Amino acid sequence: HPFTMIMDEFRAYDGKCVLVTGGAGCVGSNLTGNLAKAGANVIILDNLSSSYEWNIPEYENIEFVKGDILDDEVLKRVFKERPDYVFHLAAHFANQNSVDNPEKDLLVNGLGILKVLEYAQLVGVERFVYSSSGCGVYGLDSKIPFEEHDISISLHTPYQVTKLLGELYTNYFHNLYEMPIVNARFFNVFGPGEVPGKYRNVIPNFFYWAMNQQPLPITGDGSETRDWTFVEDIVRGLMAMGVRREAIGEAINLGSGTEHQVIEMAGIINELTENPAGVVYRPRRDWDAKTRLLSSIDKARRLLDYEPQVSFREGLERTHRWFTENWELIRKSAEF
Amino acid sequence: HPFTMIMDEFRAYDGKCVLVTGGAGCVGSNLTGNLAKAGANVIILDNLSSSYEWNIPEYENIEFVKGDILDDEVLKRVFKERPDYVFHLAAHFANQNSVDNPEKDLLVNGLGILKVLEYAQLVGVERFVYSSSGCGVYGLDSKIPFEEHDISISLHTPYQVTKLLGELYTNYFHNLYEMPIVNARFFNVFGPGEVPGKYRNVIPNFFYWAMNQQPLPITGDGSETRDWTFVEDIVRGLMAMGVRREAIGEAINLGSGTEHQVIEMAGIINELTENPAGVVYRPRRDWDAKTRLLSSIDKARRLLDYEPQVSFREGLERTHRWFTENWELIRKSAEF
Ligand SMILES: NC(=O)c1ccc[n+]([C@@H]2O[C@H](COP(=O)([O-])OP(=O)(O)OC[C@H]3O[C@@H](n4cnc5c(N)ncnc54)[C@H](O)[C@@H]3O)[C@@H](O)[C@H]2O)c1
Numbered sequence: 001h002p003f004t005m006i007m008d009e010f011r012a013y014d015g016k017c018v019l020v021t022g023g024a025g026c027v028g029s030n031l032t033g034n035l036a037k038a039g040a041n042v043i044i045l046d047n048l049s050s051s052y053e054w055n056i057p058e059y060e061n062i063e064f065v066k067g068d069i070l071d072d073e074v075l076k077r078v079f080k081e082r083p084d085y086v087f088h089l090a091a092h093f094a095n096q097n098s099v100d101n102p103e104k105d106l107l108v109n110g111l112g113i114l115k116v117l118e119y120a121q122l123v124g125v126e127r128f129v130y131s132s133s134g135c136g137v138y139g140l141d142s143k144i145p146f147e148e149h150d151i152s153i154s155l156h157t158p159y160q161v162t163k164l165l166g167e168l169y170t171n172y173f174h175n176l177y178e179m180p181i182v183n184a185r186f187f188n189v190f191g192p193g194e195v196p197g198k199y200r201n202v203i204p205n206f207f208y209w210a211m212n213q214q215p216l217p218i219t220g221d222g223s224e225t226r227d228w229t230f231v232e233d234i235v236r237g238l239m240a241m242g243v244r245r246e247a248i249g250e251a252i253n254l255g256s257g258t259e260h261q262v263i264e265m266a267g268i269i270n271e272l273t274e275n276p277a278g279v280v281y282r283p284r285r286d287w288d289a290k291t292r293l294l295s296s297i298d299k300a301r302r303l304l305d306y307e308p309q310v311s312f313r314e315g316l317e318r319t320h321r322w323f324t325e326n327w328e329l330i331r332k333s334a335e336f
Numbered sequence: 337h338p339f340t341m342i343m344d345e346f347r348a349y350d351g352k353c354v355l356v357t358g359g360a361g362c363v364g365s366n367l368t369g370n371l372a373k374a375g376a377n378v379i380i381l382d383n384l385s386s387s388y389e390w391n392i393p394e395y396e397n398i399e400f401v402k403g404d405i406l407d408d409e410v411l412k413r414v415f416k417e418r419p420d421y422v423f424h425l426a427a428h429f430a431n432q433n434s435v436d437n438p439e440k441d442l443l444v445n446g447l448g449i450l451k452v453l454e455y456a457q458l459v460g461v462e463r464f465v466y467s468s469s470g471c472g473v474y475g476l477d478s479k480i481p482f483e484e485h486d487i488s489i490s491l492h493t494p495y496q497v498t499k500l501l502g503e504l505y506t507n508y509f510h511n512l513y514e515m516p517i518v519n520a521r522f523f524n525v526f527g528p529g530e531v532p533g534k535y536r537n538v539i540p541n542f543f544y545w546a547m548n549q550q551p552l553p554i555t556g557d558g559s560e561t562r563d564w565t566f567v568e569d570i571v572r573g574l575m576a577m578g579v580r581r582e583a584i585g586e587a588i589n590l591g592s593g594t595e596h597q598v599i600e601m602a603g604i605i606n607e608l609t610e611n612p613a614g615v616v617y618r619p620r621r622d623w624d625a626k627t628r629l630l631s632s633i634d635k636a637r638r639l640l641d642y643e644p645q646v647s648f649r650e651g652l653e654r655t656h657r658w659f660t661e662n663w664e665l666i667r668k669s670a671e672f
Pocket residue numbers: 021022023024025026027028045046047048049050051067068069070088089090091092093108112131132133134185186187188189190194201
C-alpha cells in the first residue's frame with residue numbers, strides 16, 4: 001500500500017486529547033470519527049445551531065458537550081481537560097446567513113475564535129488548526145487559480161470578512177505568543193454529514209430537492225464554477241496539519257484543484273437520484289460576485305503531501321448513499 | 337495664494353450635517369473645528385473613554401453627544417439627524433491597550449464600526465470616511481516604504497487586527513451596498529489635542545514627562561523610526577477624502593513620507609522643554625516588532641493633491657505651545 005504517511009503520521013493522535021469546536025457539523029463529524037479511529041480522546045463543543053446530534057459518530061472515546069464558544073463557563077469545562085490539539089471548526093455559516101445577520105456573524109466568528117484562542121493560550125496546545133475559507137480570503141483582484149500569498153481585503157459578505165478575521169487572530173497568537181497555528185483554507189466542501197437547509201450548501205440542497213422530484217434551482221446561468229472538495233480529503237489535510245511541523249504558522253489551501261460547472265453538478269445529481277424534474281434558472285444571488293473559484297493546491301502538496309483521493313463523481317455517489325441511508329432523519333431535520 | 341483646492345473644495349461642507357464618531361479625541365477635535373469653520377453642522381458622538389470634554393472646540397454649530405458607538409439607542413439619536421458625511425474616528429486605542437483587553441478591542445473596533453456602517457446604510461450618506469492605520473495593515477512582509485496594495489494579514493496586536501477589520505467592513509458595504517467609503521491609513525499622528533496617558537502615543541507622553549523634568553524612557557535603542565504626521569495635515573487629507581469622487585472605494589495612506597529616529601524626537605522635545613533629565617533606555621515592548629515605519633504618500637498626492645505642510649520640527653513646536661497653554665487641564669486630566 002502507498003498510504004504510509006497517511007497511516008503512521010496520524011498514529012500520533014493515539015491517546016491524545018483533541019477538542020473539536022463545531023464537531024457535530026459536516027467537517028467536524030467526519031474529522032471526529034477519524035480521530036476516534038486513530039485512538040484520540042475527542043471532545044466536541046457544538047451548540048447545534050446548524051447541526052443535529054444524530055450526525056455525531058458513535059465512538060466510546062467521543063464526548064459531546066452541547067454549548068456555545070461564546071460562553072466562558074463551557075469553555076473552562078472543555079479547556080480544563082487540557083486538550084493537546086484544537087481544531088476550531090465552529091462558525092456562523094455562511095454567505096447569505098451572514099448578510100442577513102452580520103452582528104451575530106461577527107460575535108460567533110470573531111469573538112468566538114478569539115475566546116477559544118485565549119483559552120488555548122492559557123493551557124498550551126501542540127497545534128491550533130482553524131478552518132478558514134477560500135471564498136473568504138480571495139477576491140475579484142485575486143488571480144485564478146488562487147495561491148496563498150494572493151489574498152484580498154475586498155470582500156462580498158460578512159462571512160468572508162469574518163473568515164479572514166479568524167486568520168488575523170490565529171496569526172496574531174502565533175506572532176506574539178508563539179502559538180502553533182495552521183490556517184486551512186477550505187474550498188466548497190461536500191460529502192456525507194451535511195444536512196440540507198435554507199442557509200446550507202448547494203449539493204445537499206440539490207440532493208434533497210432532487211429526491212423529492214423537484215426542479216433544481218440554478219442561481220445564475222449554470223456556467224458558474226466551483227472547486228468542490230470531498231470532506232474525507234479535507235479531513236486528511238486537517239490531520240496532516242495537526243502533526244507536520246512545516247505547517248506551523250502557515251495558510252494552506254485544501255481544495256481539489258479542479259473546477260466544475262454548476263450545470264454539470266446539477267446533471268450528475270439528477271442522474272443519480274433519477275429526478276425527472278430537471279433544472280430552473282433564477283437570478284444570481286446579489287452578494288455572489290465571485291462566480292469562479294479554483295484553488296491551487298501545490299503548497300498543500302509540498303508541506304502536507306496532500307493529494308485528493310476522491311473524484312467529483314465518486315464524492316457525489318458517496319454523498320447520495322448517505323442521503324438514502326439517512327433519508328428519514330434528513331427529512332425530519334431539514335429546515336428551509 | 338496657492339491654496340485654491342484646500343479652500344474652495346472644502347466649502348462643500350457649508351450647511352452640511354457631519355457626524356464625527358470619536359470627535360472629542362486628537363484627530364476628532366481638530367477635524368470638527370475645521371468642519372465648523374467651513375460652515376458644517378457637526379455632531380460628535382464620543383463616550384470620553386480616552387478623551388476629555390474640554391478638548392472639544394467651542395463653536396455654536398458643534399453638538400456634543402456623550403455616548404457609545406455600541407449603544408443602538410444613541411446611534412438612532414444621531415442618525416435620525418440624517419448626516420450627509422460620517423467620519424468614523426472612534427476606536428479602542430491602541431497597541432498595548434488591545435493586547436491587554438482584546439475582547440473589548442474587538443467589540444469597539446469591530447462591532448462598533450459594523451453598527452455605525454449599518455445605520456449609515458439605513459439613512460444614506462454622501463461619504464463614510466474611516467480612520468484605518470498604517471501599523472494595522474502593513475506587516476514585516478510589507479516593503480518599506482509602504483504602498484497601499486502591499487498589505488499584510490500577519491499582525492502583532494489585536495489593535496492592528498481590528499484596524500484592518502474596519503477596512504474589511506467598509507469594503508464590504510461598498511461592494512454589496514455601494515456605500516461611498518474611503519479608508520484613510522494614518523501614520524503616527526501627532527499634534528495639539530492628544531492628552532498624555534498610560535495607553536497614549538510617545539510624543540505627548542514625552543512632553544508631559546519632559547515638562548516634569550523627568551528622563552524620557554526609550555523603549556528600544558533609539559534608532560527605531562516612525563513616520564510622524566502632523567494632525568492638521570491629517571485633517572486636510574480627511575476633508576479632501578469627503579469630497580473627491582476619486583477617493584471613493586479607496587485605501588489611502590496619510591503620512592509625512594519621511595522618517596525620524598526616536599532618539600531625534602526625544603532630543604527635540606528635551607530641547608524645547610529645556611528638560612535637563614535626558615533619556616533612559618528600557619527594553620522594547622514585546623509586541624513592537626515593526627521598528628521602522630515609513631509611508632509612501634504618492635497615492636494621496638494623486639487622488640487628493642495631498643502634501644504635508646508642517647515639518648516635524650514645526651509640528652513639535654505647535655504641540656509644545658498647546659501643552660504650555662493647557663498645562664493645568666493636562667496635569668489634571670493625564671491618567672498613567
Ligand atoms: N463547507 C464549506 O464549504 C466550507 C468552506 C470554507 C470554510 N468552511 C468552514 O469550515 C468549518 C466547518 O464547516 P461545515 O461545513 O462543517 O459547517 P457546519 O455548519 O456543518 O459546521 C459548523 C458547526 O458549528 C456549530 N456552531 C455554530 N455557531 C456556534 C457557536 N456559537 N458555538 C458553538 N458551535 C457553534 C454549528 O452548530 C455546526 O455544527 C466552518 O468554520 C466553516 O466556515 C466551510
